[PDB]
């Protein structure tokens, strides 16, 4: 680089631009951390709700296994097929796409409409609620991880 007065003025201008850009990036990082410190507590509340759902579903499953017997449980498992329809629609967070989970939960996927196996049906309901609890937990966790990686990049 040839030393001229014009070059010196241009380099001093570039130095001023860099000094402004550093502070601008620091402000962006502060905003990202402000979002992150609320997203983390949302994730914590979702996690404890999922824990409660798991506890009640396991209790109902134990009651269905003990009293109704493995025969009725196996028959219900045979009669209920798995679910194939899921949605992975993309959500935008700070220019980065993330998958947003949505399970269809359709009608007709559960059989044996009679209420005689009372212990099995309640376990089915509990696991049905467990499904959406797990979906909520995953939907919060993916955003939390992406915000963490964005903060990493800006730092």
């Amino acid at each position: 680089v040839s030393p001229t007065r014009m070059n010196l003025l241009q380099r001093r201008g570039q130095l001023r631009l860099a000094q402004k850009g550093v502070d601008l990036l620091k402000k962006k990082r502060d905003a990202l951390v402000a979002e992150f410190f609320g997203l983390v507590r949302e994730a914590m509340e979702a996690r404890k709700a999922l824990d409660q759902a798991a506890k009640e579903a396991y209790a109902a499953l134990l009651l269905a296994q003990a009293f109704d017997g493995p025969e009725v449980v196996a028959g219900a498992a045979l009669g209920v097929p798995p679910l194939e329809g899921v949605e992975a629609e993309v959500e935008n967070v700070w220019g980065s796409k993330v998958p947003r989970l949505k399970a269809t939960f359709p009608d007709g996927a559960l059989l044996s409409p009679v209420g005689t196996p009372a212990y099995t049906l309640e376990a089915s309901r509990a696991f049905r609620r467990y499904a959406e609890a797990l979906i909520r937990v995953a939907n919060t966790e993916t955003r939390l991880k992406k915000i963490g990686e964005e903060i990493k990049k800006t730092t």
């Binding site: 001229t4 014009m6 631009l17 402004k20 601008l24 220019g95």
Partner: protein, 192 residues
């Protein structure tokens, strides 16, 4: 000598002239002519010529020229952020300004001195090009508020109509301008 603007002849000339058209080597390298540095150029005769422009070109011509200058200043301000984080990190209200500035630089300011038609440009042709660009900018700003994506606004066919208005002959421009102004409305009435 060597393009150094701190030359005593250049500095002595600065204090006694009315207009200053500074040229840039970076624009000349990429064959962008007339290669006038917009940031380092000025003119002191602008305010004294406004009545002539009002009585000889159009009544609203100074407002159009000042809007163009404000657009160029806005584009110049944002380039110190794109250099930092890249053009894809901005919002759509800034990408639109960037694209409008690029359109203005590559259509209005550029001029070929060896072309048959583009070598000479009258005042009314420049006024028409400025009016078309400002109308497009207003429509594109309106379309963003409806949630239309920016990446398809620039794909509209009227951008090529704007970008080739330079080469239209002086005797054909009064019809080309009207059909382009109608095409702006006809394209922006319903995008998607």
């Amino acid at each position: 000598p060597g393009g150094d603007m701190s030359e005593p002849v250049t500095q002595s000339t600065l204090r006694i002239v009315g207009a200053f058209w500074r040229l840039d080597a970076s624009l000349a390298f990429r064959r962008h002519f007339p290669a006038i540095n917009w940031n380092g150029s000025y003119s002191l005769f602008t305010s004294a010529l406004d009545p002539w422009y009002r009585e000889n070109v159009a009544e609203d011509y100074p407002e159009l020229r000042d809007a163009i200058s404000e657009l160029l200043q806005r584009e110049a301000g944002l380039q110190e952020i794109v250099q930092l984080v890249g053009p894809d990190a901005l919002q759509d209200a800034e990408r639109l300004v960037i694209e409008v500035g690029r359109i203005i630089r590559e259509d209005f300011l550029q001029q070929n001195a060896y072309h048959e038609v583009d070598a000479y440009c009258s005042m009314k042709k420049a006024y028409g090009i400025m009016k078309m660009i400002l109308a497009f900018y207003k429509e594109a700003e309106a379309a963003i508020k409806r949630g239309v994506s920016i990446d398809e606004i620039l794909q509209l066919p009227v951008l090529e109509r704007i970008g080739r208005a330079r080469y239209v002959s002086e005797e054909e421009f009064p019809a080309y301008f009207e059909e382009a102004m109608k095409e702006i409305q006809g394209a922006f009435k319903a995008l998607a």
